[PDB]
Design a protein around this ligand. Structure first.
Ligand SMILES: [Cl-]
Ligand SMILES: [Cl-]
Ligand SMILES: [Cl-]
Ligand SMILES: [Cl-]
Ligand SMILES: [Cl-]
Ligand SMILES: [Cl-]
Ligand SMILES: [Cl-]
Ligand SMILES: [Cl-]
Ligand SMILES: [K+]
Ligand SMILES: [K+]
Ligand SMILES: [K+]
Ligand SMILES: [K+]
Lengths: 173, 173, 173, 173
């Protein structure tokens, strides 16, 4: 229950306007450019402020490539059927910067008519105090526009694995 | 899936307060004069600002009669059982005018006690990038007051046909 | 369908926050003194402004006793098991008065701990243009506190009968 | 029906944003620190202002230990698997104080990463006028964080027993 129950809470934390029930194979969806932007930026802002939000026993974790914070990738048709992959890494200092210069980068000027998808990925670490067992949560938020139907499908994927209790930082401690 | 999935997105784009599920044979309904006005004007305003809203690969299309923009028709009992049909054509320049003089025309001074229906019709063009196939969407928004029961039923009808890829303008490109 | 469909519209017009589906044997309910007041005053205000709200082919009708406007009755335990019935008649001039002095009467200083129920009753007249047949709607809004359980159950009752087409006044004509 | 129907009304009165239907074995839930605080403080504030809210025939009652008002208890892991229980008693004078100094106590500086649960308990007295029978309601609001899953489950428990009609004070009388 610990890993599965944390996944539900992550959907409520990171998916803007999540109703509490998945729409279909995806958690929720958007139909406008404004709502797509607001959902992407909400997920990033909730990650940035996670210590003042979460009710769990969690902390930030390093990614698979040792980069810290969020990896934001996007796929879009090249200007001229070829698909181009672009990624940006937003660490904790990037997200805490004032002005938050990362929001004005060219990466976030999305061209929805040729955008296939946006993916946000990050790791969280959690401790199961009720049993202690430490988990690494590999989280991915996918903004799927591959159908190009006017609807973006939003998925929250979380793979959790038991790991050694090494990372000390738990939010609120 | 492309034409059918675009129809769902059109309901979210053009029907004010659409819950995401059709009420019955119609998509949604209104019970007040204020809500009837707000739903009609919302559909027109969403069409006017479509390039900054849609997540799809769409553009405006010409109507069957070569008129551009929206055709708004209304049916009402004549002043004196005979039904009178009145139509107005709102092109892109009409909708972009400041002040938007079209909103103050006598056509939009509705008399609900004798109004049978209001119909908004327009064409959109779309490209199925996932497969390319070009579609013409013949859209009709019907505000049905024929029951005169205090409830206006709102339908969104879309007939989509495959056509030659001739029109160049796709929103955001 | 005409009389039954008008009843649905009346629930949307006169019952504050009506969800569109009846809760149980009653249409909706309230759990606070503020919400009870707001629902009662909303029903009265919607009646007062009915000509600028309804989408139907309706007009005001005289009551069974020839009094015009709304009859508001309340039942409460006497100060000292005996039930006392008090009524007020709010005609169209009472509801249009500025200040609306009727709202400050002692009748509307409700004592919820001993209040059994509040009843609002009025007649509306309607014409079935689709077929013409004229209907008299005998409407009653009941705020039922007889259980004294902390929940007021709100019912909308409408009995409609075919009558001669004599009354001329239809809202918006 | 009297005791059971009052329980439904208590859920609407004391549980912030209660939808009217229990989520599962609990009435509702929260996923953020802000929402946890807002739900706890709402329950206390609704108790404090109960005379201007309830539609029932109720009054405040003494607790099992003769203390008046609310007992708020919390369970949390000690700083250094041992569980510590801390309680505060908020009487009617504490809740009516300006500034309400009770809100700034160290007790209400919650540490969610080690918080097991928060419990609010109080008694209400009610009279069944429809039949008179007097009831004592032993109410408990539990904010359950024992899973440490990121979700706090909120329960409303009410045990009601018939007692002698001795307490005079009924709200609004
Ligand atoms: Cl935008
Ligand atoms: Cl892009
Ligand atoms: Cl209006
Ligand atoms: Cl008209
Ligand atoms: Cl009040
Ligand atoms: Cl009263
Ligand atoms: Cl907070
Ligand atoms: Cl604590
Ligand atoms: K998984
Ligand atoms: K069709
Ligand atoms: K009836
Ligand atoms: K019980």
């Amino acid at each position: 229950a610990f890993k599965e129950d944390n996944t539900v809470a992550f959907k409520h934390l990171f998916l803007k306007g999540y109703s509490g029930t998945d729409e279909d194979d995806y958690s929720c969806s958007v139909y406008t450019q404004e709502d797509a932007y607001e959902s992407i930026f909400f997920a990033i802002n909730q990650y940035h402020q996670l210590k003042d939000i979460t009710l769990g026993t969690l902390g930030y974790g390093e990614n698979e490539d040792n980069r810290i914070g969020l990896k934001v990738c996007k796929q879009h048709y090249k200007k001229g059927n070829d698909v181009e992959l672009d990624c940006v890494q937003l660490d904790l200092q990037d997200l805490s910067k004032k002005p938050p210069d990362w929001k004005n980068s060219s990466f976030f000027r999305l061209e929805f008519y040729r955008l296939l998808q946006v993916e946000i990925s990050f790791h969280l670490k959690g401790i199961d105090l009720q049993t202690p067992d430490c988990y690494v949560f590999q989280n991915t938020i996918i903004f799927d526009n591959k159908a190009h139907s006017g609807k973006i499908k939003i998925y929250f994927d979380s793979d959790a694995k038991i790991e050694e209790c090494k990372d000390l930082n738990i939010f609120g401690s």
